[PDB]
Structure 1
Amino acid sequence: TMVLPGVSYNETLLTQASNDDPVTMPLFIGYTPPPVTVMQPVSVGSLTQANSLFGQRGTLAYSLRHFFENGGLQCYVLPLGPGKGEPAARLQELIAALQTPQMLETLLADDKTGLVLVPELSELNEVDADALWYQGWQVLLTLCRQAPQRFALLELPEDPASAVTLTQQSFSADQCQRGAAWWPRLETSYQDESSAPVVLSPLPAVAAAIQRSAHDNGVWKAPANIALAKTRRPTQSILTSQALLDNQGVSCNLIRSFVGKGVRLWGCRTLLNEENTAWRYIQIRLLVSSVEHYLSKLARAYLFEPNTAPTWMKLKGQVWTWLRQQWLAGAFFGTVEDEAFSLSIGLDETMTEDDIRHGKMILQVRLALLAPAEFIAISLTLDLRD
């Protein structure tokens, strides 16, 4: 009478809680779509939550739809405000907002994400464009250098000799180490409210391929050889623009399409164009920072302990156990343990008595990592035999 218990119908979202994986968590830093707080990062769960917060049409809204339809697990969005309009002015207030010291108080006091991404620098293609591109990268490459474990996801402009002049620009070695560019911008299958297709940056498709091939295969594998789901084609192929093959700038990653298989990510190699330093190869930078994230989790468990020799060996025994299990899981190179990793805490091994009295506890880890199979050098031998 008072109540009628029965079967209803509604489209509310139940949601899911905590996907962890802080190292491969993307962070989208576009402008708010036209009641989230103007600065705090917002946990976006499924694609239903991305529409219930941010609508369906925009620039950040299509990048979230292209994130979860490429196999993304969870994303965070850092809003910035209801931007102006006249998009040559939104896109120099975007860079000016990212240079504020209030960006550092939100990225350093975050500890939930690990892939910095601004997908709205793709709008610079419409639009000095070169000046805006270089202080678009270099602002992102310093927010990650400063932060303990963040990786930038960058992109090149479509026009060659504007993407050539960006790679032939000065970036310090410390900064290159942590950030990557994928060149060909993606033509999606989303309508633009008319017959014409929506062209998005490749980077929401990349950040979904990074954290699903780190969830499925492990973060040590590679982010490449991944079929991009809901893309028609990359807007430009490498057979029509032989620029960017000039070996005089930062390493770039190519997104291509094949015949028997679709649009593939076809590279994993950081902005370091150095042949011997193993801080190229994205999965090397993301594996060793996934070991930073856990070994510093059990290090600060033994933090406000005495500096006596028992607590040094309580810490080696826990780190040696964990590193041996990851070697037997396939994460490190080496057919014996002596060439896979090493630990060396001690009083006259790493520390000294002056280091102990200042309250330090210094532990050394050496690692041996795996190399990709980027080139297959087939040979044929006849072997006559009568």
Structure 2
Amino acid sequence: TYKTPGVYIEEITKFPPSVAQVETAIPAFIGYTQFARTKPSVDSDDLILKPKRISSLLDFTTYYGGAQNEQGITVKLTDTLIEGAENRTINVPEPTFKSPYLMFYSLQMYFANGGGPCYIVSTGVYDDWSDSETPPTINFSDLESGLAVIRKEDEPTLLLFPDATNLPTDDEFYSLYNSALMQCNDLQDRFTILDTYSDQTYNDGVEDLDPIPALRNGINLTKDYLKYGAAYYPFVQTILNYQYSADEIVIQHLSYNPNAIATALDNLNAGTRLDDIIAAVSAAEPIDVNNGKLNGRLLSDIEPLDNATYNTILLEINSHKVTLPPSSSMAGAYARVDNDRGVWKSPANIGLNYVSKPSVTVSHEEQESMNVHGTGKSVNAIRSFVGKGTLVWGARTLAGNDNEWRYISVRRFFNMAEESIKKATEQFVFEPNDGNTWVRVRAMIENFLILQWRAGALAGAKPEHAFYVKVGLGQTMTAQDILEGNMNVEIGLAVVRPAEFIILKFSHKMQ
């Protein structure tokens, strides 16, 4: 609210914004938020299980809030002498206890990589911490509820779960993904993006398990379901920071020349209960033989004592970055390819934005079992290339040995074409079932396919070699279908598949 016409000046720190226009790659994201409201001034959460469409990160923030503050950051400062000179080191370790809520960070990566409008489904709001070593948990039943809700929406094409890797067990994780694949099979218009449970060996509570075999045994559905999704490995390191407050951070201070107790006494000595405190404290001077002046204080309480320490520590805290599963980055990448090259091209050999590096290095030889395997349950790799950065390498589905459906771009092209055609055919639903209708429907479908051919989506020198459409009594329908009100239309398409291998050969030129 401003009252005087004119120009106002503010000073802030942030990353610049990014938006995009996307028609064919709209994801839904199911998970936890800070709050969920329809108006800025309400007495409750209005949107907990209500899908909402968001155009940009600002719209998200407006109704759902930001990230949860981390409560696992500690600081250790040590004072020593070098040939009689003072020298100190400030060390801020990576936290071992982190907030389990990743939707905010996930969306930042999505928009950074070119994503457009999307659907948000809340499952609840962020819970609190029990202690500095005891974080909130993720409730499996809340994610199932959100999935049941999105099932009633028509617009979404991709399904993602930003907080699935934080579920208490791997069994719950795999169960959630099996349900998502089954939903895609029943609706015939969706595709899922999958992560491993962890990018490192995980502890089952009874055994040490390797993440790739884990996922392969975890997802046990057949061909009909596997054709509707794909998986990526490893996790990636981003350039995003952590959200925190100096009020929650405590400093340990060690010194070659201790003075924590003496400091407390000088201040305490500066009524009956005050005397008891001082005596109790002075008794400890013989005990403390390691701690310096700042030991035990919070960052926000030492700035006036030494703002060089305060500022140095904040700078060190800022050097720690966020690590994420790659699924939201891939949803972003899918949108970029559809806009620049088309849905019929493979979503691979794509650079990712805001990625420093893969968390795990994958060698050439190590990928052979990821691309080709006896089970067909292929995994695509994220790899670092010299002079190029982090690229998506490979584009197969979870049915990698399927002669018709092994490539992602074939499955996605068909889903697109099928959706567009049925929208076009709905205008004829209550028309008479006769020759006049059969001709109108056929002509409409062929015109659509001619345009797809003209744009280079279909194979063939002329439309006659790219597709066919058939309808008629004695061809696709019988007398019984006419009596029951059925209409049968048959369509066939010629679709182009990519090359994967290039072999070079060298020799010594001779006559």
Residues 239 and 383 (structure 1), Cα distance of their counterparts in 2 relative to 1, 3 Å cut? closer
Q: 1:274 to 1:115 in 2, by over 3 A?
A: same
Q: Tell me the alpha carbon deviations over residues 3-53 of structure 1, each in whole angstroms, 9 at most, x when there is no partner.
A: 988346599xxxxx99562x4211110112361511121222122223333
User: Contact 1:164/1:243 (CA < 8 Å) preserved in 2?
Assistant: no
Are the counterparts in 2 of residues 234 and 256 from structure 1 also a CA contact under 8 Å?
Answer: yes
Map of 1:274-353 to 2, 5 A cutoff?
274-276=401-403, 278-353=404-479
Indicate how the Cα distance of structure 1 residues 183 and 136 shifts in structure 2: closer, same or farther if over 3 A, else same.
farther
Contact residue 199 and residue 233 of structure 2 kept, 8 A: yes
Give the alignment of 1:176-191 within 5 angstroms. 176-191=226-241
1:38 match: secondary structure: coil
SS of residue paired to 2:33: coil
Establish whether residue 173 from structure 1 lines up as the match of residue 223 from structure 2. Answer: yes
Matches of 1:109 and 1:130 in 2, distance apart?
27
3-state secondary structure, aligned to 2:347: coil
Determine if contact 1:182/1:254 at 8 Å carries over to the other structure.
Answer: yes
From 224, 242, 245, the equivalent of 1:192 is: 242
Partner of residue 142, structure 1: 182
1:163 matches 2:212: yes
| Aligned counterpart in structure 1 of residue 385 of structure 2, from 238, 251, 258 | 258
* 1:30 partner letter: G
Instruction: Check if 1:228 corresponds to 2:352.
Output: yes
- Aligned partner of 2:502 among 358, 376, 380: 376
Determine if the alignment matches structure 1 residue 29 to structure 2 residue 79. no
SS at match of 1:80: strand
> Is the counterpart of residue 360 in structure 1 residue 360 in structure 2?
no
Q: Distance in 2 between matches of 1:380 and 1:84?
A: 63
Q: Secondary structure of the equivalent of 1:204? A: helix
Q: Residues 144-166 of structure 1, C-alpha deviation per residue, up to 9 Å, x if partnerless?
A: 22223111111113125133122
Structure 1 residue 168 displacement after superposition: 3.4
1:243 deviates by: 8.0
Q: 2:33 is matched by which residue type in structure 1? A: T
Instruction: Give the counterpart of 2:173 among 121, 127, 133.
Output: 133
Q: Tell me how far apart the structure 1 counterparts of residues 226 and 63 of structure 2 sit (CA, whole Å).
A: 34
Aligned amino acid, residue 335 of structure 2 = Q
* 2:94 aligned with 1:44: no
Distance in 2, Cα, partners of 1:289 & 1:243: 29
Gaps of 5+ in 2: 11-18, 39-46, 69-101, 202-209, 244-316
Residues 33, 61 of structure 1: 8 Å contact kept: no
CA–CA separation in structure 2 for the residues paired with 1:41 and 1:245 = 39
Contact 1:188 1:231 in 2 (8 A): yes
1:243–1:274 CA distance, 2 compared to 1 (3 A) = closer
2:29 and 2:120 in contact (8 A); partners too:
yes
What is the distance in 1 between the residues matched to 2:113 and 2:367?
Answer: 29
- For 2:280, the equivalent position in structure 1 comes to none
| 2:163 aligned counterpart, secondary structure | helix
Is 1:118 matched up with 2:161? yes
Q: Which moved more, 1:46-55 or 1:278-287?
A: 46-55
Q: Which residue of 2 aligns with 1:14?
A: none
Per the normalisation by structure 1, the TM-score is 0.87
- The answer to whether structure 1 residue 6 and structure 2 residue 5 are counterparts is yes
Equivalent position to 2:104, from 34, 54, 61: 61
Cα distance 1:173–1:367, how it changes in 2: closer, same or farther (>3 A)?
same
Q: How far does residue 318 in structure 1 lie from its aligned partner after superposition?
A: 0.8
Distance in 2 (alpha carbons) for counterparts of 1:281 and 1:240:
21
3-state SS, counterpart of residue 77 of structure 1: strand
Q: Which amino acid aligns with 2:55?
A: G
SS at match of 1:153: strand
Bigger Rg, structure 1 or 2: 2
Q: Over residues 240-268 of structure 1, what are the superposed CA-to-partner deviations in whole Å (9 max), with x where a residue is unaligned?
A: 99488262331111111111101111121
Q: Distance in 2 between matches of 1:327 and 1:279?
A: 21
Q: Does the CA contact (< 8 Å) of 1:173 and 1:272 recur in 2?
A: yes
1:267 and 1:9 map into 2 onto residues whose CA distance is 50
| Structure-2-length-normalised TM-score | 0.67
Residues of 2 paired with 1:10 and 1:298: CA distance? 52
Cα distance, 1:230 vs. partner?
0.2
Q: What is the DSSP-based 3-state SS (H/G/I as helix, E as strand, rest coil) of the residue aligned with 1:280? A: coil
- What amino acid does structure 1 have at the position aligned with 2:178? Q
Distance (Å, rounded) in 2 between the aligned partners of 1:218 and 1:240:
29
Preserved CA contact (<8 Å) 1:24 1:211: yes
2:400 and 2:407 in contact (8 A); partners too: no
Q: Secondary structure at the match of 1:313?
A: helix
Gapped regions of structure 1 (runs ≥ 5): 12-16
Cα distance 1:243–1:46, how it changes in 2: closer, same or farther (>3 A)? Answer: closer
Identical amino acids, percent of aligned pairs? 31
Q: What SS does structure 2 have at the residue aligned with 1:116? A: strand
- SS at structure 2 position matched to 1:187: strand
Q: Which has the higher contact order (CA 8 A, sep 6+)?
A: 2
